[PDB]
């Protein structure tokens, strides 16, 4: 049947609140509470990583020659896509010296992530079924730039029953006014791979922001705040879907709920600017019947957006931020607990 298709990368004004609503997600600024249980691992070379990253940046923005573009507008999609691919592939190995799990990891390159779920009720407005009661259905078809898939699950950021004073925003409207549109076709729950795959769990995702959503364009449209919102929304969608699907690969569903919190990480990027997100899925039951007495929430932590570099000029990378590298490093250093 007929469902709303939720797009993770959205032109709609405040899609963060709406998506929180659809997902039952609480948003908290700042990264999750630091797991101080960490061993004295960081023997990391910050200079070999500066070097390794700037190799990518410079290769893309300067060295590599592309068959000449008549636009000269230099599409940031066409520049940043290979930069990001190379960034992930590069850091993966370099930090795989420290974190052996990334050796057994699968790297996914622009492959679909699908999640389908039910939320709420509706009294059908029009038609011959007018007046009867139906659930609101949602589908997320997503295409992350890069994924890292593992054979064993990442650890929970907070316990399963962890509670927060802040409440999930309740929109007063139909989803239609977002805008959002109904359509119907096959409903798929897909993780980036089929069930038969031995790597069932997510590590982190890498989302390159599409061209429409550039900071410049938004600044032209008299949208200031939205610059942030677009990031949030993206995470809140993509991550959720990913987590959701992971959960349903483990047999959990609306009436089985979930035993152990499912977690995944994500990075969202305009080629210059980065943002880091952590998502813990607790409740898989958002259904009308299943959400009645249910206390739990899904939680999403996120970072304010922030520049990697400032103004590449002629094979020099002028401004540079190590904090960005350090957080990317945090995320890439996460591990399954060991028994």
Partner RNA sequence: ACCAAAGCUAGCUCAACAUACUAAACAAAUACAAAAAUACACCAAAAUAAAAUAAAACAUUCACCUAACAUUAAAGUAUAGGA
Partner RNA sequence: ACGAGCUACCCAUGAGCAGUUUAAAAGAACCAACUCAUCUAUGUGGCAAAAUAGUGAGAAGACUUGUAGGUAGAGGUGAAAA
Partner RNA sequence: CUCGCACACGCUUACAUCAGUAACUAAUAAUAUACUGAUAAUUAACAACCAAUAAACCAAAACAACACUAAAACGUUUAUUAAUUACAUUGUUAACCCAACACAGGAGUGCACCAAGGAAAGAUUAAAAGAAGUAAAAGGAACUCGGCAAACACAAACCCCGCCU
By CB under 8 A, name the binding residues for another protein. Answer: 52, 55-56, 58-59, 62-67, 71, 82, 85-86, 89-90, 92-94, 96-97, 100, 103-104, 106-107, 109, 111-112, 114, 188, 190, 193-194, 196-198, 315
Other CB atoms within 10 Å distance of the CB of residue 310: 12
Q: How far is the CB of 213 from another protein (least distance, A)?
A: 14
Q: How far is the CB of 22 from RNA (least distance, A)?
A: 12
Give 90 or 294: the residue with its C-beta nearer to another protein. 90
| CB neighbour list of residue 299: distance below 8 Å, 6 or more residues apart | 25, 26, 28, 157, 158, 162, 164, 279, 280, 282
Q: How far is the CB of 86 from another protein (least distance, A)?
A: 7
Regarding 126 and contact with RNA (CB under 7 A), the answer is yes
* Region of 70-78, 87-95, 189-197, 324-332 interacting with RNA (CB under 7 A): 70-78
* Binding site partner of 37, from another protein, RNA, none, Cβ cut-off 5-8 A by kind: none
Burial of 115 (0-12, 13-18, 19+ CB in 10 A): buried
Q: Which of 33, 45, 100, 129 binds RNA (CB under 7 A)?
A: 129
Give per-residue burial for 117-139: e unless 16+ CB within 10 Å, then b.
Answer: bbbbeeeeeeeeeeeeeebbbbb
Q: Which two tokens stand for residue 271?
A: 């080629």
Regarding 195 and contact with RNA (CB under 7 A), the answer is no
* Binding site partner of 151, from RNA, another protein, none, Cβ cut-off 5-8 A by kind: none
Q: How far is the CB of 72 from another protein (least distance, A)?
A: 13
| CB neighbour list of residue 165: distance below 8 Å, 6 or more residues apart | none
Give 132 or 260: the residue with its C-beta nearer to RNA. 132
Instruction: Find out whether 315 and 147 touch, Cβ atoms under 8 Å.
Output: no
Rounded to an integer, what distance in angstroms lies between the CA atom of residue 142 and that of residue 237?
9
Q: Which of 277, 205, 214 is nearest to 11 (CA)?
A: 214
Burial of 31 (0-12, 13-18, 19+ CB in 10 A): middle
Rounded to an integer, what distance in angstroms lies between the CA atom of residue 138 and that of residue 165?
27
Regarding 2 and contact with RNA (CB under 7 A), the answer is yes
Q: Under rule CB under 7 A, which residues in 199-218 are in contact with RNA?
A: 212, 217
Regarding 116 and contact with RNA (CB under 7 A), the answer is no
Q: How far is the CB of 106 from another protein (least distance, A)?
A: 7
* Binding site partner of 181, from RNA, another protein, none, Cβ cut-off 5-8 A by kind: RNA
Instruction: Find out whether 187 and 139 touch, Cβ atoms under 8 Å.
Output: yes
Rounded to an integer, what distance in angstroms lies between the CA atom of residue 86 and that of residue 59?
10
Give 21 or 96: the residue with its C-beta nearer to another protein. 96
Q: Applying CB under 7 A, which residues contact RNA?
A: 1-2, 5, 7, 9-12, 15, 67, 70-73, 125-130, 132, 176-181, 183-184, 186, 212, 217, 220-221
């Amino acid at each position: 049947f007929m469902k709303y298709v939720v797009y993770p990368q959205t032109f709609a004004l405040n899609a963060d609140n709406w998506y929180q609503s659809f997902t039952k997600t609480v948003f908290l600024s700042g990264l999750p509470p630091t797991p101080a249980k960490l061993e004295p691992e960081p023997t990391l070379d910050i200079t070999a990583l500066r070097e390794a990253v700037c190799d990518c940046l410079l290769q893309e923005h300067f060295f590599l020659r592309r068959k000449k573009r008549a636009p000269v507008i230099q599409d940031r999609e066409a520049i940043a896509s290979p930069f990001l691919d190379q960034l992930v592939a590069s850091l993966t190995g370099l930090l795989s010296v420290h974190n052996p799990v990334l050796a057994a990891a699968a790297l996914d390159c622009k492959r679909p992530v699908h999640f389908f779920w039910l939320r709420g009720e509706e009294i059908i407005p029009r038609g011959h079924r007018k007046g009867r009661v139906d659930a609101l259905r949602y589908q997320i078809n997503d295409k992350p730039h890069n994924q890292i898939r593992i054979s064993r699950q990442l650890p929970e950021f907070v316990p399963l029953d962890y509670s927060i004073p802040i409440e999930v925003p309740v929109m007063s409207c139909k989803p239609d006014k977002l805008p959002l549109f109904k359509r119907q076709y096959e409903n798929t729950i897909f993780i980036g791979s089929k069930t038969a795959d031995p790597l069932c769990y997510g590590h982190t995702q890498f989302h390159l922001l599409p061209d429409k959503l550039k900071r410049e364009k938004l600044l032209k449209q008299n949208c200031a705040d939205q610059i942030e919102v677009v990031f949030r929304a993206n995470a809140i969608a993509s991550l959720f879907a990913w987590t959701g699907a992971q959960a349903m690969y483990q047999g959990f569903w609306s009436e089985a709920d979930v035993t152990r919190p499912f977690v995944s990480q994500g990075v969202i990027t305009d080629g210059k600017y980065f943002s880091f997100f952590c998502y813990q899925l607790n409740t898989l039951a958002l259904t009308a019947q299943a959400d009645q007495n249910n206390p739990r929430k899904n939680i999403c932590w996120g970072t304010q957006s922030k520049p990697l570099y400032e103004t590449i000029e002629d094979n020099n990378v002028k401004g540079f931020n190590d904090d960005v590298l350090l957080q990317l490093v945090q995320f890439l250093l996460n591990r399954p607990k060991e028994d």
